[PDB]
């Protein structure tokens, strides 16, 4: 009985399966991610199209696991396919049941990565590209160590010294006086000083949104 399913692979349906992967790739550019739960008509039919893609992919997984066995299938590039099927099943089930349920929808963007695998004419060029990656690992560790050293030095020197900016001296409203907050340091500390009518006092005017300063170690890195 398993042969009847297996001989189907002799019939080239892999062409239709790759056209299905391409169809799903197309069915993700149309999906507009509206800001906060909004959704036009198209986004309300792409769930149905996604259900169809789920069914076809899981049928293919069943066929190619039954015809090729449970143990042997993972021992191949198909590792991702079953992974995608598992996460997509879980996503659909949880979404229907109802939290990180929605955000988990991103795991489908790997399906285009199935396209390159399906056309073995490209796996060669992928292998070529990653083959040249190994020599860089020495440069990778060198740059990693340079980053660590310079981040630690920055922590030692610029130890959160960019949190004081120039404030209005009238004092009615305490907002960063300069439209472009430029960290200033009050006298007794080398640096710039406010203009003739403002005062540089502590606070967190700081750099843009406080994302680029040297406060933590992660910020330094």
């Amino acid at each position: 009985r398993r042969a009847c399913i297996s001989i189907v692979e002799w019939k080239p349906f892999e062409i239709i399966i790759l056209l299905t992967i391409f169809a799903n790739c197309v069915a993700l550019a149309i999906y507009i991610p509206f800001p906060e739960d909004d959704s036009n008509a198209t986004n309300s039919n792409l769930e149905r199209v996604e259900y169809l893609f789920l069914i076809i992919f899981t049928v293919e997984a069943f066929l190619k696991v039954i015809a090729y066995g449970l143990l042997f299938h993972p021992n191949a590039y198909l590792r991702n396919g079953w992974n995608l099927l598992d996460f997509i099943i879980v996503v659909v089930g949880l979404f229907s049941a109802i939290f990180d349920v929605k955000a988990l929808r991103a795991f489908r963007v790997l399906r285009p990565l199935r396209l390159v695998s399906g056309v073995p004419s490209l796996q060669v060029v992928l292998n070529s590209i990653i083959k040249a990656m190994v020599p860089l690992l020495h440069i990778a560790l060198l740059v990693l160590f340079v980053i660590i050293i310079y981040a630690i030095i920055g922590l030692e020197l610029f130890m959160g010294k960019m949190h004081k900016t120039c404030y209005n001296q009238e004092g009615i409203a305490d907002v960063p006086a300069e439209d472009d907050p430029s960290p200033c340091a009050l006298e007794t500390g080398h640096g710039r000083q406010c203009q003739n009518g403002t005062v540089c006092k502590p606070g967190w005017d700081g750099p843009k949104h406080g994302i680029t300063n040297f406060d933590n170690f992660a910020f330094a890195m």
């Binding site: 020495h138 560790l141 060198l142 160590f145 660590i148 050293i149 981040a151 630690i152 030095i153 922590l155 030692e156 020197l157 130890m159 959160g160 949190h163 406060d215 933590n216 170690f217």
Partner: protein, 103 residues
């Protein structure tokens, strides 16, 4: 230990880091003394790496000695602090491929 410190630090945390700083500089001074006993200064200065270690440990102790006074209170020169981190470069020497490439 070096990377741990961060802005808005706790006075207890600063004290603990000072303790660990003294401990680590002590261990590296033990490194130095054991190497010297292993072989004399003329052989100690044979490779620059140990000479490179020479200035780091002295600078670190200079840092610790300078730390005895309290210009700030747990309620100036800041150059020798970087030798501690620069000592990390020794770790880059263990790898041989990177060593030969950079050299």
């Amino acid at each position: 230990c070096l990377a741990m410190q961060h802005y808005g630090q706790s006075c207890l945390f600063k004290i603990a880091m000072n303790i660990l700083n003294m401990l680590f500089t002590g261990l590296f001074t033990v490194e130095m003394i054991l190497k010297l006993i292993a072989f004399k200064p003329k052989g100690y200065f044979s490779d620059p790496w140990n000479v490179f270690d020479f200035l780091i440990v002295i600078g670190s102790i200079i840092d610790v000695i300078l730390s005895e006074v309290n210009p700030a209170e747990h309620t100036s020169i800041t150059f020798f602090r970087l030798f501690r981190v620069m000592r990390l470069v020794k770790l880059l020497s263990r790898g041989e491929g990177i060593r030969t490439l950079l050299w």
